[PDB]
């Protein structure tokens, strides 16, 4: 499935992903495209903090659905 990823910037990222793939495996995808670690990213889907060890699917994340990423400097 495609999914969209909203950042601080303004930026929109679009990625492809398979149902069960981990909210970890999504953060390696956004560090590759836009070069911010994926320890520093927090994403959000529908008011709810996800967890890098649970999957899309686990989250009801759909063809088309719109994560929001959010950081994490310490
Ligand atoms: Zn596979
Ligand atoms: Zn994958
Ligand atoms: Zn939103």
């Given at each position: 499935?495609?999914?969209?990823?909203?950042?601080?910037?303004?930026?929109?990222?679009?990625?492809?992903?398979?149902?069960?793939?981990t909210?970890?495996?999504?953060?390696?995808?956004?560090?590759?495209?836009?070069?911010?670690?994926?320890?520093?990213?927090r994403?959000?889907?529908?008011?709810?903090?996800?967890?890098?060890?649970?999957?899309?699917?686990?989250?009801?994340?759909?063809?088309?659905?719109?994560?929001?990423?959010?950081?994490?400097?310490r």
């Amino acid at each position: 499935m495609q999914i969209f990823v909203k950042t601080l910037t303004g930026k929109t990222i679009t990625l492809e992903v398979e149902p069960s793939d981990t909210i970890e495996n999504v953060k390696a995808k956004i560090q590759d495209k836009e070069g911010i670690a994926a320890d520093q990213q927090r994403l959000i889907f529908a008011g709810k903090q996800l967890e890098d060890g649970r999957t899309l699917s686990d989250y009801n994340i759909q063809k088309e659905s719109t994560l929001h990423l959010v950081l994490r400097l310490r």
